[model samples]
Target: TQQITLIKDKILSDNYFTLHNITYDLTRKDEVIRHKREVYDRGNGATILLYNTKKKTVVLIRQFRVATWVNGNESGQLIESCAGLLNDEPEVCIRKAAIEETGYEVGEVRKLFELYMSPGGVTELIHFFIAEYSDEDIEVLELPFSQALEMIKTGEIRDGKTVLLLNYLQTSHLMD
Candidate 1:
């Protein structure tokens, strides 16, 4: 096992936009090597899966993402499950984002999973969730900037994670 020891850490520069920092580390594998590491200033974000039983629907947000697609083209991005990460409390942030993005307050949020958002080059951590909005009488919110969300049961849209979560709920009899 490689042991890492931190020599020093300091915040070099920072503001509301970003923070810069430098750190010293000693990596010991076959031999000990010292190096300087820099960390960028970034906050967290959150997203959620808003489930509405009354309409048997799941709300998705269609927006812009710069990540590559299957064909390696910079596609216009696709619709996705209510997802976001908060620089604050992850549960609270994701719950709030779900409301803002899809207009359903997941009265309670239960954490489902967490990912590095891809550590290869990004400092982002993504949190996935399952929120239960049992209030069928409550009005579901819509976004003006969002395209009409493809209905889940109707198979209008086929977002990957959306499919996973929905199938989990369906097979497990979660949404009844």
Candidate 2:
């Protein structure tokens, strides 16, 4: 077995979230390899898609992601599902997010999945959910399920969690 041993962690920053330089050793068949990795630590979060079957629309959100801008999204606005960092609980945070951002007090929600949207270095896991919104609208962005899916192919809706939740609705035939 190639066992790993942690040598030390050098704290990089705590300005917004904790960042660290992790020094560790990995034992190979013949040697122990020392390696350094930079890790980002942020609280996990939750997201939800509020769909209205009657209207054939889903509630989404549009906001700026600075990181995306830095990486080349000129406008920096990211079209995403309603999301918020988990505080009390994922379920609680999602419902609260839906209300605060989308103005929809959803009755019931089903968890589709959880994911490490950015696992390479960011320590953030996203809880994904879906629910039916009875008759609502608002940036608070709402659009037809098909239109949302089209964006995925167009590269406009590239956020992992949003894409996953959108396709989840499609795969389950729930949006149909």
Candidate 3:
């Protein structure tokens, strides 16, 4: 006699990563079967960690993301790093994002690390970098953006990634 078994469940998928369901039969020897239940799309993006020497500041942007707004975002405020990797070269994406968000040109970008924001869950790998800006290049940007505004004006801003980068810089005593 042969026995067949199947699992009835809903599988959730993410960009570039998919999840499926598996069924096994243990009655008549060990047997297993797996089927693709859902498909996930793919997308690319990157983040830039910028450090300014003169002002002793790490530059970040305040923007709005729909997901962030889902949790009763009474202010709709999000502090983010200079981000732009919609579909460009990682380095180029970071550079342009820096310019757009902070109006600063990229200098020597030292790639600190690269990681998937959520490997088991999502299809996203973010390139983390520390871009060292020179005094001259910093001047070129002229700090054109308004630093003190909105949520920053209201209270402490929050961006976990940016905060982590800054903490690394500080803990390493790289402030000199």
- Find the candidate with the highest TM-score and give its number: 2
lDDT of 2 at 159: 89
C-alpha lDDT (0 to 100) for residue 158 of candidate 1: 49
Residue-level lDDT tens digits of model 1 in 139-158: 33332211233355454444
Per-residue lDDT of candidate 2, residues 1-39 (tens digit): 279899999999989889999989998887888989899
Please, what is the TM-score per model? 0.60, 0.92, 0.63
Q: What is the total number of backbone clashes in candidate 2?
A: 0
Candidate 2 off by > 4 Å: 136-138
TM-score, ranked from best to worst? 2, 3, 1
Worst 10 residues of 3 by lDDT: 136-145
The predicted structure with the larger TM-score, 2 or 3, is 2
Poorest stretch of ten by lDDT in candidate 2: 133-142
TM-score of candidate 3 against the unseen true structure: 0.63
- Compared with the true structure, all predictions reach lDDT values of 0.58, 0.88, 0.59
TM-score of 2: 0.92
Candidate 1 residue spans exceeding 4 A from truth: 7-24, 35-41, 53-55, 66-75, 85-87, 134-176
